[PDB]
Amino acid sequence: MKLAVYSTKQYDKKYLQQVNEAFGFELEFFDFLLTEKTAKTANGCEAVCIFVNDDGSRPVLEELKKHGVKYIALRCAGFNNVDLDAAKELGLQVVRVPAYSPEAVAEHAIGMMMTLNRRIHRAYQRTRDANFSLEGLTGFTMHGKTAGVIGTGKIGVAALRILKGFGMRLLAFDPYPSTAALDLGVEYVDLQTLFAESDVISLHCPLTPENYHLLNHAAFDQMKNGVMIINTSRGALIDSQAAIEALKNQKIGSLGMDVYENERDLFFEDKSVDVIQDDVFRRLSACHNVLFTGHQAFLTAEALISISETTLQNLSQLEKGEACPNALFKHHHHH
Amino acid sequence: MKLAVYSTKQYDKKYLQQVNEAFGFELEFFDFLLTEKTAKTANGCEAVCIFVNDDGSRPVLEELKKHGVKYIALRCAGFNNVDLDAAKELGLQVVRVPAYSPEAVAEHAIGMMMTLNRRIHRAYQRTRDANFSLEGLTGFTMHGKTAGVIGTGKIGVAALRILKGFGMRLLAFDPYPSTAALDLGVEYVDLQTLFAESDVISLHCPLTPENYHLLNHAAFDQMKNGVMIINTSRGALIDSQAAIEALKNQKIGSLGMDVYENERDLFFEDKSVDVIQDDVFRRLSACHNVLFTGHQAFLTAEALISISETTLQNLSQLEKGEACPNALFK
Amino acid sequence: MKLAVYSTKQYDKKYLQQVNEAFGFELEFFDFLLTEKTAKTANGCEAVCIFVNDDGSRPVLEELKKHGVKYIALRCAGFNNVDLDAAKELGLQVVRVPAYSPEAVAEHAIGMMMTLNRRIHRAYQRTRDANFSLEGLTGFTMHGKTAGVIGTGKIGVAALRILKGFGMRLLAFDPYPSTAALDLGVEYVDLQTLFAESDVISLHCPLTPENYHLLNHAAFDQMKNGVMIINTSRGALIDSQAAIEALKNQKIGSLGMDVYENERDLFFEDKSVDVIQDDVFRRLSACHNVLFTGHQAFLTAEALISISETTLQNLSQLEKGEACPNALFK
Amino acid sequence: MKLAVYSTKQYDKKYLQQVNEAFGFELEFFDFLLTEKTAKTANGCEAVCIFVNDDGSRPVLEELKKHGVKYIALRCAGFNNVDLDAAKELGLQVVRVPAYSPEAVAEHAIGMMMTLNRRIHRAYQRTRDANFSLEGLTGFTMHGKTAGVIGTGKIGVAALRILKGFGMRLLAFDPYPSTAALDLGVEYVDLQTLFAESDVISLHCPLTPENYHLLNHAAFDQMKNGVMIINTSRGALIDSQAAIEALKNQKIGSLGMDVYENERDLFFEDKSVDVIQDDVFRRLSACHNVLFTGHQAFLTAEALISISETTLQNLSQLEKGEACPNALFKHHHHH
Ligand SMILES: NC(=O)C1=CN([C@@H]2O[C@H](COP(=O)(O)OP(=O)(O)OC[C@H]3O[C@@H](n4cnc5c(N)ncnc54)[C@H](O)[C@@H]3O)[C@@H](O)[C@H]2O)C=CC1
Ligand SMILES: NC(=O)C1=CN([C@@H]2O[C@H](COP(=O)(O)OP(=O)(O)OC[C@H]3O[C@@H](n4cnc5c(N)ncnc54)[C@H](O)[C@@H]3O)[C@@H](O)[C@H]2O)C=CC1
């Protein structure tokens, strides 16, 4: 099989290449986005591998079919960029990565928490220029504080295990509480209680209509002053305009956000005047204890390997006519 | 009692003031270093309070006695800056903070590990300027890796609990076993085995004559390529020239060092008769996955309060003629 | 003479030591502020040398007298920190430096202008990380633009020569003409015209009662969209809140400010209050093409050497008992 | 006419769109590199507009011809990326921009000099975070110092005008001395004299066999300690390895280099290594008074507009069958 990979970053290429020693596919790497115009680059490939910014809408799918492509593989969990209804009509098969390594994501959340707490990002900014001042760097001791985790799927639970290690009092909210968490000594609570008592709050849940703007002004009002908020889940979970105010009023002590590529263009203040973010990313980072990372939560060697393994295996199943458990369909509840 | 605080930073002032609400000392804050020249500023204070950079050598103490000081309180664990024998000769009394909050120090080490691992420090420099590129930011998953902790005292144990939460395999080297460490499932091993097997190495031990340059050229040779090394302990535990070389060779993946103020004129490479260089700090930080923090490991609100509480308590005990357990000699 | 130097920076020491060769004085460098409390450190010295942040108030001056000091030498132009008549009464003598090198200040204003224009400060933050992206860095060609200079004294004339070398049209506002500006082909205009026509505006004038908030909201309304504004003069020439607004609505393209230490504490956004901060320096630097320097305009080796020469000489005039032109009274 | 633009950056798009109001071409903007693989995206276009990293080798040109392309426009001065011999053989006409605005380039060189002199880039990194310390920021007064300019074409002369305004003593070297400079008050001198006497040295010359590694170890030894060196000309003008050593030894006070995209990969480390990296850019910037810009010298609105005007005008002349003075041929001397 010949595979064309779009939107390739160096890490994608390295891991896909490394993983491919097992599959022996023919790999063609493209830096650029898949679009209706670039689809013709796929001629002679059976499959394409795409990521979050790639265009999988119907006209792109039509071009891919004209050019002989049969399989579309997303090297990511998100799939909203792909028109599944069109894909079915075209007889095109679509596969994904089900979930990122839970340990990799939870660890990233924890990394963000600590970086913010000890002001390590600021410290490096000084020390790289041999400035050793500590003023404004003071953090807080984690042990004996309360951590609140929103969502107790595998990521949340992986977070909860690290948090326990810190010797934190553990609270969680999930509409469906888990046995694994309960076994860890987590206390399930209502949201309001979680808002009220938590020193650190970490979001590990999918975005559903129930939880759009889950953290709103009313939520911020409920929180402790100086609270730390970490979001490696989707942006919409937070009302960003509320979050900004909370920062100004110093309700939020610290904020860390892992910004999905598909979400950055909003994720804003925001005004219908002039000028907006990206300036907002710059301002917050400068004026507050604010940290953005660029959808980095899965960015470890082991996780990337997993993503590559799953993607190549999915493709292998498709070419072989084996039923692939990662197949997507139009009625999928998260489409 | 009037207390003159030297080398005052904004945090020192804030926490000392807050804690003193329960004590009522008369606090006089000075920004500058205590030296033989500045010691006269203390005239009219029974006590002084000092930190690692302040000069406690015999000539300074001589001036302090001249000027009526009876007590010296180090708002720190280290006392290498104070000449204890001269202090006793002069009839001065010296007290200290015995240990920092073990949790604060260990958490700092963990924070350093995570910032380095995920290149969070590099990431910030990009995103503060709305550069969202991820290339070169690749880390490693902690879970299922081996951590090697050198020293199983209170800090090392506090680190081991966190490292367990990460799901790491646990190794340690200590001349003495800790029951709390054992309870964690820590496997004590010889140092070479720890060097050979450890993905992440963290230093949590006091500097002794036995352990000067504990991490040397041979130690690095033993280590796994890509190893992460963290030092929130004293600098002289690591042979800096050998670490620099290990970085250049790519034996060391990541290095985090919490740089003692008194130790900054070390870590040198160096050259003969040129400057004093902090240029190395700049060079290493640019070239490699290296992080320096400036003796930041106890820098939390809770640890600072504790330091302050202990210092004022030490002083109150002297004033009352009580025996202070934190005295450096009788 | 033994001279004690307060508030010493490395640069003060280096240049002061250099100039001392012609003088032979004994110095005495202190990093700290001169205050009522530290004045006693001067004992043994005939003279002290102070800068802008040092305390020259009456009590400081008494303590200094008590401790045997006769002469106070400023290494700056400004003297509002010092109590003049009080010194007279004490029979204390105080010498200053008349003005800083005009070329050094003008060159700095031009440096600021170009750094802002080409976003050189932004490019460097990218390129230090080996990020070579150009997007957002676009400047404007200077040649053929209109430069507006407010104040045609020595610094302003120095700025004008440079601006002329760039091939700029030259406007100025001064209540007095300078023959040297006229010779450059400078065309004097009313302020409103200068505001209307100028691509680049640079301030080179002292603060007078009649120019406080010269650059105000009405002034900003007159200006071209995208205007670049430089102030190496005193902060109060610009109404800071108006400037912030004009930045927000994009009337001001670029703003460069050399921020006086004694002025830093104002710069009003200005919220009240929780609690006083220069979050504003941070917000402005991030959200716009804004550059702050820390009273850096006179900071060159040649300028420092000059400040050093005048100061030491100023001292010799005193010791010889001869007159000081830079003396602030008899 | 339909024009496909490769390697498009946002400033490129903005100026080309603005300029096109007068031309009325159909513009299609592509972010990615023109390659043999992406050449097919030009189908339906008479022309392409490319920049320094675009691949103009014969296989690409062959593909462009197959897809109907007639004209190739370089929006830059450099042209080594295009195989002119192949272009003639295929009947493809190639045009370029002859030179960049001389004022824009000279002004960039001066801007670098001043930022480096006053350490303005360092000041900003401190002041953006409200750090006002001046230690290490000390400069030198330009007035009364000596400037050496190497190359007296239009850029060098434009640079000399600015430098004259600083009240600098001016020296230059050019194998063919210019009237314009002589009229400025410039003293033409031999190189060793220029090296010996110059406080600031700026390069404004084309790269020739005669001047490859013009600035070498011997050049550096002749220089004044603390010399400032600015290069907005090509990289090969300086022996970088030698420049690094002079920096270590503190022969060079400050160095500014505008790094051509096509030259980025060079600038030797060395040890050739892994092989080859720009940790050296990172190090130099950190350990020394060093500044890189990424070929930013022509990056002003006025200069970009010129580039755009020239580019569209060259294309209209080609479509109209008028002789375009910017046409490139294989016997061109450069090359
Ligand atoms: N960045 C910073 O400011 C801080 C640095 N430290 C350093 O880290 C050390 C550990 O702190 P604590 O647990 O409070 O000390 P502790 O005195 O409770 O225990 C020290 C432990 O390290 C062990 N040890 C001694 N020599 C050793 C060697 N060669 N190898 C392995 N282990 C050895 C001891 O047997 C003991 O278990 C301190 O002694 C201190 O010097 C401690 C606090 C803050
Ligand atoms: N950032 C820095 O380091 C420095 C800033 N400066 C500032 O720049 C100022 C000027 O320096 P010099 O040229 O040496 O002074 P100078 O006395 O030679 O010239 C002052 C000029 O400004 C004019 N002026 C007075 N009021 C005016 C107004 N409302 N509008 C326009 N012009 C007015 C005077 O008529 C005179 O021509 C200083 O007074 C000082 O405040 C001075 C030295 C260093």
Side-chain angles (χ1 to χ4, degrees), chain A residues 1-79 81-277 279-335, chain B residues 1-79 81-277 279-330, chain C residues 1-79 81-277 279-330, chain D residues 1-79 81-277 279-335:
Chain A
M1 200 200 282
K2 202 181 171 183
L3 174 67
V5 190
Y6 293 83
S7 286
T8 305
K9 300 303 181 282
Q10 188 57 237
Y11 53 83
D12 297 318
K13 162 153 72 204
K14 162 195 180 57
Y15 302 109
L16 275 167
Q17 276 179 338
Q18 172 179 323
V19 175
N20 188 57
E21 213 187 278
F23 297 81
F25 287 164
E26 197 192 326
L27 303 177
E28 169 105 299
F29 291 101
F30 298 127
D31 288 1
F32 49 75
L33 291 152
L34 167 71
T35 72
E36 204 195 337
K37 317 193 209 258
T38 59
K40 47 166 60 58
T41 66
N43 195 294
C45 294
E46 288 189 274
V48 309
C49 177
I50 58 168
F51 192 62
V52 308
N53 296 127
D54 295 306
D55 191 351
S57 63
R58 165 181 286 281
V60 197
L61 307 179
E62 277 169 4
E63 268 305 279
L64 290 172
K65 173 156 190 200
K66 287 171 183 156
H67 288 275
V69 175
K70 285 142 66 174
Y71 321 121
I72 294 137
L74 293 134
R75 62 177 185 280
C76 57
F79 64 95
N81 58 331
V82 183
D83 181 338
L84 297 172
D85 181 41
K88 176 148 166 236
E89 283 186 28
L90 297 170
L92 281 171
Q93 300 185 264
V94 185
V95 301
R96 71 168 190 159
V97 176
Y100 308 116
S101 152
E103 297 63 33
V105 182
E107 292 167 17
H108 190 73
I110 279 37
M112 293 187 86
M113 252 180 223
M114 290 319 288
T115 293
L116 280 155
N117 180 332
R118 314 297 290 260
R119 275 71 161 167
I120 312 185
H121 59 314
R122 304 219 190 248
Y124 175 73
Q125 191 173 69
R126 284 173 202 192
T127 72
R128 70 172 176 165
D129 289 323
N131 168 13
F132 290 106
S133 169
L134 301 184
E135 306 207 312
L137 305 189
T138 300
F140 64 91
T141 296
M142 301 272 263
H143 188 270
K145 304 291 193 287
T146 300
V149 169
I150 306 179
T152 60
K154 275 170 156 157
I155 312 175
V157 178
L160 281 164
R161 298 178 184 109
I162 303 151
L163 296 149
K164 182 177 200 202
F166 274 96
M168 298 175 93
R169 172 186 164 227
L170 318 175
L171 308 176
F173 169 82
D174 201 285
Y176 299 92
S178 97
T179 267
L182 200 69
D183 286 354
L184 268 180
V186 180
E187 178 172 4
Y188 287 93
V189 295
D190 55 288
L191 270 185
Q192 297 58 49
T193 304
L194 195 135
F195 292 156
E197 303 193 36
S198 291
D199 313 294
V200 175
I201 293 162
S202 197
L203 287 156
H204 303 289
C205 58
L207 169 62
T208 72
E210 286 70 65
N211 72 17
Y212 176 96
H213 288 197
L214 191 73
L215 266 46
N216 55 16
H217 281 106
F220 298 130
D221 264 2
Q222 286 194 70
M223 296 171 205
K224 303 169 89 149
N225 273 315
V227 63
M228 180 187 280
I229 296 175
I230 308 294
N231 192 18
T232 64
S233 289
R234 288 197 167 269
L237 287 157
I238 294 176
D239 169 342
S240 80
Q241 309 188 140
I244 295 179
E245 284 297 305
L247 284 158
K248 283 169 53 238
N249 301 319
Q250 316 185 90
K251 172 71 67 162
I252 293 173
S254 308
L255 178 69
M257 313 176 23
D258 201 40
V259 178
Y260 285 58
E261 295 82 341
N262 48 291
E263 286 196 334
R264 82 184 253 206
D265 286 0
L266 278 95
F267 205 136
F268 282 26
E269 254 250 36
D270 52 305
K271 207 124 110 195
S272 280
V273 175
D274 53 53
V275 47
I276 308 70
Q277 219 95 344
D279 285 4
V280 173
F281 292 121
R282 308 201 174 94
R283 173 168 42 94
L284 302 179
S285 297
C287 310
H288 305 283
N289 206 27
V290 176
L291 168 74
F292 305 94
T293 56
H295 204 190
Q296 212 184 311
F298 64 82
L299 199 83
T300 72
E302 302 71 13
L304 294 162
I305 288 174
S306 293
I307 275 158
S308 284
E309 267 169 20
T310 289
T311 298
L312 302 173
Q313 185 57 18
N314 289 340
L315 286 164
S316 178
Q317 295 170 321
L318 294 186
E319 88 166 343
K320 297 210 282 234
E322 313 179 348
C324 165
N326 292 312
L328 294 175
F329 42 97
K330 168 196 164 175
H331 62 282
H332 190 306
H333 185 249
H334 304 108
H335 211 247
Chain B
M1 191 197 289
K2 195 171 157 171
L3 177 70
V5 181
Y6 289 92
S7 288
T8 304
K9 300 297 183 297
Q10 109 282 3
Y11 53 89
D12 300 309
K13 192 141 95 88
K14 160 184 177 53
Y15 298 106
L16 274 164
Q17 280 183 332
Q18 184 184 117
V19 177
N20 188 55
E21 270 158 11
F23 289 91
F25 287 91
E26 177 183 6
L27 306 171
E28 168 125 281
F29 296 97
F30 291 126
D31 296 5
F32 46 85
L33 282 153
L34 170 75
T35 74
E36 149 265 312
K37 312 285 311 189
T38 61
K40 52 183 80 174
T41 54
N43 183 295
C45 299
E46 281 167 89
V48 305
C49 174
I50 51 160
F51 194 64
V52 311
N53 313 127
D54 301 294
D55 187 6
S57 74
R58 172 175 300 125
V60 189
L61 305 179
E62 172 197 328
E63 278 302 286
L64 293 172
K65 174 153 180 190
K66 232 179 88 183
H67 287 277
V69 176
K70 310 170 190 150
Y71 320 120
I72 302 176
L74 293 135
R75 61 178 186 277
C76 52
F79 54 86
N81 62 319
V82 180
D83 178 348
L84 284 342
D85 298 317
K88 171 97 152 305
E89 265 317 305
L90 293 156
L92 289 170
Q93 291 175 266
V94 192
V95 294
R96 67 150 191 182
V97 177
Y100 299 119
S101 158
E103 291 69 26
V105 181
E107 284 169 22
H108 193 267
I110 274 60
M112 291 187 93
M113 292 178 176
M114 291 314 291
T115 301
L116 278 170
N117 179 334
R118 317 283 301 253
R119 282 72 171 166
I120 299 161
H121 64 311
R122 309 282 184 169
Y124 173 74
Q125 285 308 142
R126 300 188 190 170
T127 70
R128 67 170 346 272
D129 290 328
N131 173 9
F132 295 90
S133 162
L134 299 189
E135 267 165 15
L137 304 178
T138 296
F140 66 89
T141 294
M142 301 283 270
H143 185 278
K145 307 278 195 291
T146 302
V149 167
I150 296 165
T152 52
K154 299 190 140 180
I155 305 168
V157 173
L160 288 158
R161 300 200 188 276
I162 301 164
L163 295 155
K164 196 180 188 218
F166 279 95
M168 293 181 94
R169 176 182 190 226
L170 313 173
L171 321 179
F173 171 85
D174 204 296
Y176 302 91
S178 152
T179 303
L182 295 159
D183 287 346
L184 296 180
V186 177
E187 295 178 27
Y188 285 104
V189 294
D190 51 281
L191 194 56
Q192 208 80 308
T193 300
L194 188 149
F195 291 158
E197 303 180 7
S198 297
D199 312 286
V200 176
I201 306 174
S202 197
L203 300 156
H204 303 292
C205 64
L207 168 75
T208 64
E210 300 76 71
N211 68 18
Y212 184 86
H213 291 188
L214 187 63
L215 285 51
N216 58 16
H217 186 6
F220 298 121
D221 283 353
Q222 299 301 124
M223 291 168 197
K224 285 167 85 162
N225 282 321
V227 68
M228 176 181 291
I229 302 180
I230 310 289
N231 194 21
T232 55
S233 292
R234 274 173 71 188
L237 289 157
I238 302 174
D239 170 355
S240 78
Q241 280 161 54
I244 282 164
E245 277 308 322
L247 285 162
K248 294 205 296 225
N249 268 13
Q250 321 217 283
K251 169 59 78 196
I252 293 165
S254 302
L255 176 71
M257 283 171 138
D258 196 45
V259 179
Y260 284 56
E261 292 87 341
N262 47 297
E263 324 198 57
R264 225 118 66 207
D265 62 11
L266 263 60
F267 299 83
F268 278 26
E269 186 159 354
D270 183 5
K271 25 276 231 203
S272 33
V273 153
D274 226 80
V275 199
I276 352 166
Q277 214 59 290
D279 262 8
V280 176
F281 293 117
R282 311 183 174 95
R283 168 167 73 87
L284 296 188
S285 303
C287 290
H288 316 270
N289 202 39
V290 174
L291 170 71
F292 300 101
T293 49
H295 205 195
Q296 205 183 311
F298 63 78
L299 198 89
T300 71
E302 304 73 16
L304 290 162
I305 282 165
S306 273
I307 286 163
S308 283
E309 272 167 0
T310 294
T311 293
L312 298 186
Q313 190 59 64
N314 282 348
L315 287 172
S316 182
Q317 288 175 329
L318 304 177
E319 183 182 10
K320 285 184 277 184
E322 286 179 21
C324 172
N326 297 325
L328 280 312
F329 54 77
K330 223 291 90 118
Chain C
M1 228 197 238
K2 172 154 175 162
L3 171 76
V5 183
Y6 296 86
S7 279
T8 306
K9 300 321 191 266
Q10 102 277 2
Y11 56 78
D12 304 310
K13 168 167 156 142
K14 162 194 223 296
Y15 302 101
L16 217 39
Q17 288 189 315
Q18 212 184 83
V19 179
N20 189 45
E21 246 108 301
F23 290 73
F25 288 31
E26 150 191 56
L27 342 142
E28 225 117 86
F29 296 108
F30 300 117
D31 301 356
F32 51 81
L33 289 163
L34 159 65
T35 64
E36 176 150 48
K37 297 152 205 203
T38 61
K40 65 185 60 197
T41 74
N43 183 284
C45 292
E46 328 225 18
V48 308
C49 174
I50 57 165
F51 193 60
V52 309
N53 289 129
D54 295 305
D55 196 336
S57 73
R58 172 183 260 295
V60 178
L61 309 169
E62 344 242 45
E63 260 303 274
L64 283 171
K65 184 17 82 93
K66 285 199 199 100
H67 286 266
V69 196
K70 305 200 267 292
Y71 326 122
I72 310 169
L74 286 156
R75 50 176 194 281
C76 49
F79 51 92
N81 58 331
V82 186
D83 186 329
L84 286 111
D85 49 44
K88 72 121 235 140
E89 315 169 6
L90 294 158
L92 275 179
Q93 276 180 281
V94 180
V95 290
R96 72 158 184 164
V97 170
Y100 307 109
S101 162
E103 285 76 32
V105 180
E107 294 178 3
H108 188 81
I110 269 77
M112 289 185 89
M113 258 171 206
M114 297 308 298
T115 299
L116 284 163
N117 178 341
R118 318 292 295 250
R119 281 80 168 152
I120 305 179
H121 65 316
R122 310 264 194 175
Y124 174 69
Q125 291 306 325
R126 301 191 184 166
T127 70
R128 78 170 300 168
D129 178 57
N131 179 9
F132 298 97
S133 162
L134 299 185
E135 290 176 346
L137 307 173
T138 306
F140 65 89
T141 297
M142 300 271 261
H143 183 279
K145 309 277 207 284
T146 292
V149 168
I150 304 164
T152 60
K154 300 275 181 91
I155 303 175
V157 168
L160 286 159
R161 305 191 166 101
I162 303 164
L163 289 158
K164 183 162 182 288
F166 280 96
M168 297 172 98
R169 176 172 184 240
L170 323 161
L171 311 180
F173 169 82
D174 203 290
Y176 309 93
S178 138
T179 296
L182 293 162
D183 287 336
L184 292 178
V186 173
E187 95 178 51
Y188 289 95
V189 296
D190 50 282
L191 194 55
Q192 200 80 314
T193 301
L194 192 145
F195 290 159
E197 304 189 337
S198 294
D199 311 291
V200 185
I201 304 166
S202 202
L203 298 158
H204 303 288
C205 56
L207 186 64
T208 67
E210 348 296 289
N211 66 17
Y212 179 93
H213 288 185
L214 190 71
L215 272 54
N216 64 12
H217 173 100
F220 296 127
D221 287 340
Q222 299 292 286
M223 289 169 201
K224 289 165 104 154
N225 280 328
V227 70
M228 168 183 297
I229 293 166
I230 307 300
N231 191 20
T232 53
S233 305
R234 297 232 164 231
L237 291 160
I238 301 179
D239 165 349
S240 272
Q241 187 60 212
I244 289 151
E245 265 205 301
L247 277 167
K248 269 138 72 183
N249 66 32
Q250 320 220 283
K251 173 67 69 175
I252 299 169
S254 299
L255 177 68
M257 304 167 48
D258 207 39
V259 177
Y260 283 60
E261 302 77 349
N262 55 325
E263 265 148 47
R264 190 166 293 146
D265 268 52
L266 295 309
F267 201 81
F268 306 103
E269 342 112 359
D270 94 74
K271 191 242 314 131
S272 320
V273 38
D274 190 324
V275 265
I276 183 217
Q277 58 233 50
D279 259 3
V280 176
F281 295 114
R282 306 167 166 109
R283 198 226 311 146
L284 299 192
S285 303
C287 300
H288 314 285
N289 214 22
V290 174
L291 170 66
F292 301 97
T293 54
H295 198 186
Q296 204 181 317
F298 73 71
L299 194 88
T300 73
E302 301 73 21
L304 295 161
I305 279 148
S306 282
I307 290 168
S308 293
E309 285 163 349
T310 297
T311 290
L312 294 181
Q313 270 279 350
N314 262 357
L315 288 174
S316 262
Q317 77 164 146
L318 279 194
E319 183 160 26
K320 258 220 322 63
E322 161 177 50
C324 199
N326 300 309
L328 291 72
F329 48 63
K330 168 213 141 260
Chain D
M1 205 212 269
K2 206 191 169 180
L3 168 74
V5 193
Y6 296 80
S7 287
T8 301
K9 301 303 182 284
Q10 183 59 48
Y11 47 84
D12 291 308
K13 178 163 159 69
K14 166 188 175 73
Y15 300 112
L16 274 174
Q17 283 177 155
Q18 172 178 326
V19 172
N20 188 59
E21 200 196 322
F23 284 92
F25 294 165
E26 210 191 315
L27 313 173
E28 178 142 56
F29 296 105
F30 298 128
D31 286 3
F32 50 81
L33 296 151
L34 169 65
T35 68
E36 191 181 353
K37 328 269 219 26
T38 62
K40 63 181 74 185
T41 68
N43 189 290
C45 296
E46 310 188 82
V48 310
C49 173
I50 55 175
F51 189 58
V52 314
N53 300 307
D54 296 300
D55 191 351
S57 64
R58 159 178 269 286
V60 195
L61 301 188
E62 283 181 349
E63 191 81 349
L64 289 172
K65 156 97 176 251
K66 280 175 201 169
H67 291 277
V69 173
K70 297 174 189 157
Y71 325 116
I72 302 148
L74 294 133
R75 54 177 193 282
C76 51
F79 66 90
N81 62 329
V82 174
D83 186 327
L84 266 359
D85 185 336
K88 160 152 52 189
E89 266 183 38
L90 304 146
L92 291 166
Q93 309 186 259
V94 180
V95 297
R96 78 168 180 165
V97 180
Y100 304 113
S101 158
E103 295 70 30
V105 180
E107 292 176 15
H108 191 74
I110 280 48
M112 291 181 89
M113 270 190 204
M114 289 313 294
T115 298
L116 274 163
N117 179 340
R118 311 302 290 262
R119 277 79 172 161
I120 311 183
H121 62 312
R122 318 213 84 117
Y124 173 72
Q125 90 187 342
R126 301 175 188 176
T127 66
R128 71 187 184 163
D129 288 322
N131 178 355
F132 296 94
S133 156
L134 309 179
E135 300 204 306
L137 302 185
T138 299
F140 64 98
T141 296
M142 310 273 274
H143 182 284
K145 307 274 206 284
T146 296
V149 170
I150 300 176
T152 55
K154 278 175 175 170
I155 309 177
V157 171
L160 287 161
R161 294 185 188 96
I162 300 167
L163 292 151
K164 190 184 195 300
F166 280 94
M168 308 179 100
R169 163 178 178 233
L170 330 164
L171 331 167
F173 167 81
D174 196 281
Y176 305 88
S178 78
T179 301
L182 194 59
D183 288 357
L184 260 186
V186 184
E187 186 174 354
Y188 284 92
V189 300
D190 75 293
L191 280 171
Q192 316 313 317
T193 309
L194 197 148
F195 291 161
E197 312 209 42
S198 284
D199 316 283
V200 175
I201 302 189
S202 191
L203 308 164
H204 306 287
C205 54
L207 183 76
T208 66
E210 287 70 61
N211 66 20
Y212 174 94
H213 289 198
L214 192 75
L215 267 62
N216 62 18
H217 285 102
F220 298 125
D221 286 318
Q222 301 181 66
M223 289 177 211
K224 286 205 213 185
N225 279 331
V227 68
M228 176 189 288
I229 299 171
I230 302 302
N231 191 16
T232 66
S233 293
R234 279 190 179 284
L237 287 174
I238 299 169
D239 171 340
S240 57
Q241 278 298 307
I244 296 178
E245 287 304 303
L247 281 165
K248 294 211 288 103
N249 303 159
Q250 287 163 284
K251 177 45 93 189
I252 293 165
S254 317
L255 174 76
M257 303 173 30
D258 205 34
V259 188
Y260 284 56
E261 288 87 346
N262 47 299
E263 288 177 3
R264 248 188 247 175
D265 289 329
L266 54 86
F267 179 110
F268 311 85
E269 290 100 5
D270 230 50
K271 316 231 197 250
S272 144
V273 282
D274 354 21
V275 291
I276 318 238
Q277 29 219 302
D279 283 25
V280 302
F281 291 124
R282 285 168 159 117
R283 171 162 49 90
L284 285 182
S285 292
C287 300
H288 299 297
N289 204 36
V290 171
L291 167 81
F292 303 95
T293 49
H295 207 195
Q296 201 184 322
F298 66 77
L299 200 91
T300 76
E302 299 77 8
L304 294 162
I305 289 175
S306 289
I307 281 169
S308 273
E309 287 179 345
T310 290
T311 297
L312 303 177
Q313 178 60 1
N314 294 325
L315 289 162
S316 62
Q317 283 175 326
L318 295 183
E319 76 158 358
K320 281 149 49 157
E322 292 159 12
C324 171
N326 291 311
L328 294 182
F329 45 98
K330 87 158 106 109
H331 48 114
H332 200 297
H333 190 253
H334 312 302
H335 204 67

